[PDB]
Enzyme design. Structure first.
Site, PDB file in Angstrom:
ATOM      1  N   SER A  49       0.883  -1.146  -0.003  1.00 50.13           N
ATOM      2  CA  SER A  49      -0.019   0.057  -0.134  1.00 50.13           C
ATOM      3  C   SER A  49       0.889   1.284   0.049  1.00 50.13           C
ATOM      4  O   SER A  49       2.117   1.081   0.124  1.00 50.13           O
ATOM      5  CB  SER A  49      -1.074   0.155   1.000  1.00 50.13           C
ATOM      6  OG  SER A  49      -0.156   0.180   2.440  1.00 50.13           O
ATOM      7  N   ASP A  82      -0.955  -1.402  -5.163  1.00 46.46           N
ATOM      8  CA  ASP A  82      -2.370  -1.169  -4.172  1.00 46.46           C
ATOM      9  C   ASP A  82      -2.903   0.149  -3.553  1.00 46.46           C
ATOM     10  O   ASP A  82      -1.941   0.878  -3.129  1.00 46.46           O
ATOM     11  CB  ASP A  82      -1.803  -1.981  -2.685  1.00 46.46           C
ATOM     12  CG  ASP A  82      -3.260  -2.714  -2.324  1.00 46.46           C
ATOM     13  OD1 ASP A  82      -3.193  -3.410  -1.053  1.00 46.46           O
ATOM     14  OD2 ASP A  82      -4.280  -2.367  -2.977  1.00 46.46           O
ATOM     15  N   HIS A 163     -12.986  -3.813   3.425  1.00 44.91           N
ATOM     16  CA  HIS A 163     -11.912  -3.795   4.303  1.00 44.91           C
ATOM     17  C   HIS A 163     -11.670  -4.299   5.810  1.00 44.91           C
ATOM     18  O   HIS A 163     -13.227  -4.119   6.509  1.00 44.91           O
ATOM     19  CB  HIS A 163     -11.016  -2.605   4.373  1.00 44.91           C
ATOM     20  CG  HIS A 163     -10.282  -2.292   2.983  1.00 44.91           C
ATOM     21  ND1 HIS A 163      -9.939  -1.160   2.391  1.00 44.91           N
ATOM     22  CD2 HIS A 163      -9.518  -3.398   1.915  1.00 44.91           C
ATOM     23  CE1 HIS A 163      -9.247  -1.206   1.318  1.00 44.91           C
ATOM     24  NE2 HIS A 163      -9.119  -2.699   1.045  1.00 44.91           N
ATOM     25  N   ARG A 256      13.295 -12.034  17.783  1.00 42.19           N
ATOM     26  CA  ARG A 256      13.405 -13.439  16.788  1.00 42.19           C
ATOM     27  C   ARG A 256      12.511 -14.387  17.433  1.00 42.19           C
ATOM     28  O   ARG A 256      11.892 -15.317  16.882  1.00 42.19           O
ATOM     29  CB  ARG A 256      14.728 -13.505  16.654  1.00 42.19           C
ATOM     30  CG  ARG A 256      15.622 -12.670  15.942  1.00 42.19           C
ATOM     31  CD  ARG A 256      17.032 -13.012  15.851  1.00 42.19           C
ATOM     32  NE  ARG A 256      17.543 -12.929  17.016  1.00 42.19           N
ATOM     33  CZ  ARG A 256      18.802 -13.587  17.194  1.00 42.19           C
ATOM     34  NH1 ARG A 256      19.677 -14.210  16.101  1.00 42.19           N
ATOM     35  NH2 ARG A 256      19.358 -13.652  18.431  1.00 42.19           N
TER      36      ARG A 256
HETATM   37 ZN   LIG Z   1      -8.039  -3.265  -1.281  1.00 42.36          ZN
END
Ligand SMILES: [Zn+2]
Ligand SMILES: [Zn+2]
EC number: 4.1.2.13
Lengths: 298, 307
Positions: A49, A82, A163, A256
């Site tokens: 995005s 995106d 979303h 980690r």
């Molecule tokens: Zn989307």
């Protein structure tokens, strides 16, 4: 190899399957995703995005994508922008070596949308880069008109999906036959019962979490959906994994020790959805046309 | 630009300040460190252990380090292999573009360490890559100065880690053998390196125990002790545990304070910021701030000429 969205979704359209476009933001998300697609010899779309690019100061997400590419030669890998909003947005993402971009002018009226988009289609195809655009639900005949005017490579349809954490599979076929190009399903995260549970079980608060059943998504793939945008599912699988390390081992402090389990939870969560999407085993089907060769397509 | 250990430490010894080498494993940590050293215009050493390279399948870390180099063109950045065990390790490191490597054969008998060290020094120097080695933890039994001078003379390493009361981990212990630091520095004439130099700040440590963590007894090296040692010839301060802790604390905090938060950027972002905040006071006390702009960085190819 770096693959355009036109060829990847084109092949998916041909053999009636979808790929699954996973949003990434850092190293462990990419590794988790790549570990699932190489285990299932599946092509993959890694998507970023504008938000992810922000968080990564651009260059870091650009380099992790190159890492992937070189580590997994032989796997067709498309790098996709995106929800790009401007021409400058996709121009920036194309300068980071992306092979595909989404120009989202959906919130605009048809002709301004057609116009914003046509502008990105010219800059992209002039370089081999594929383009995805969105419309709106989606009126099939406008879908046909829009595509004919813009010339995009893939179309994100509105079939009653959204979303975060049924549909109109009726209109998908119509849109697919009228448009003749691969359709994209955004908001397709499923919110697995496993991912949501572990999270709430280890201190989290996501009670009302539900998504698109896998089944719905497969019926959509049949009618012509070639790209399946998934993002929320990777996130919750990462978060539940560390919430769990935190309570079962409160002394652990090395990232980690939790980030690792998180990376693994994404892989395990993705494995079944790639299977069901249909792209397992297709990585080797075709030779990947480069962005340079791809220019001749336009 | 990519800088060697030899040059970077060489410069810190002359001005009596220390650089500060921070271990990295992924994207956010490298951003945390960079945001601090650029804000302080300080040189920096980014350290990658064999475990870090394994955790990142090597290439991702290679690629993350190149982003840092390219995003911050004017900051002298040394890419360093921490605790390499074998010549194959430094070969793998150097081929990822590292500009420095530590061959830690300190657990071996002198002659064997020297042997191990020597073979690595040849490989690296024939390519400009700096080498750090160790000879010698806590309430130590310490390292003998005459030995240090003999080890260096015999190996030609560019920097040397010494035992002066320090130890790895977050459970270190009150004072260091700064007396030994001074005569070793003078005897050898080369930059000294301090391992196990995390301080375990009150700030970072409280956060963890306040938000579900369990690190009750946990102590680090006082920062004043590091400033003293730095003043007597220590030019490299290795810090790893502190970053780990800073990140674990901020993540534990968003978790408790916003249990509905599930996007990794909402807790990894602060974790990365808490690391930047914790390193700023550390770096300026190290005396490194504002020095990023002194020298002009010599490439490896050109560094070959020193050997
Ligand atoms: Zn989307
Ligand atoms: Zn150490």
């Amino acid at each position: 190899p770096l693959c355009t969205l036109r060829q990847m979704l084109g092949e998916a359209r041909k053999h009636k399957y979808g790929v699954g476009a996973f949003n990434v933001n850092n190293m462990e998300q990419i590794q988790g995703i790549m570990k699932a697609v190489v285990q299932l010899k599946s092509p993959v779309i890694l998507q970023c995005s504008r938000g992810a690019l922000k968080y990564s100061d651009m260059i870091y997400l650009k380099k992790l994508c190159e890492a992937a590419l070189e580590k997994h030669p032989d796997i067709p890998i498309c790098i996709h922008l995106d929800h790009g909003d401007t021409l400058e947005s996709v121009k920036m993402a194309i300068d980071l070596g992306f092979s595909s971009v989404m120009i989202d002018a959906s919130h605009h009226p048809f002709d301004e949308n057609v116009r914003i988009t046509k502008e990105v289609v010219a800059y992209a195809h002039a370089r081999s880069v594929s383009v995805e655009a969105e419309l709106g639900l989606t009126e099939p005949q406008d879908a046909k008109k829009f595509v004919e005017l813009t010339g995009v490579d893939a179309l994100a349809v509105a079939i009653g999906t959204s979303h975060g954490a049924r549909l109109a599979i009726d209109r998908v076929k119509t849109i697919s036959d009228l448009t003749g190009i691969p359709l994209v399903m955004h908001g397709s995260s499923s919110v697995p019962k496993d991912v949501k549970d572990m999270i709430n079980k280890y201190g989290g608060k996501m009670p009302d979490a539900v998504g698109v059943p896998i089944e719905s998504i497969v019926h959509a793939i049949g009618e012509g959906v070639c790209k399946i945008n998934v993002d929320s599912d990777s996130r919750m699988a990462m978060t539940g994994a560390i919430r769990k390390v935190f309570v079962e081992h409160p002394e652990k402090f090395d990232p980690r020790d939790y980030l690792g389990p998180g990376r693994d939870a994404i892989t395990e969560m993705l494995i079944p959805k790639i299977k069901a999407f249909g792209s397992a085993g297709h990585a080797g089907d075709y030779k990947v046309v480069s962005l340079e060769e791809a220019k001749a397509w336009y």
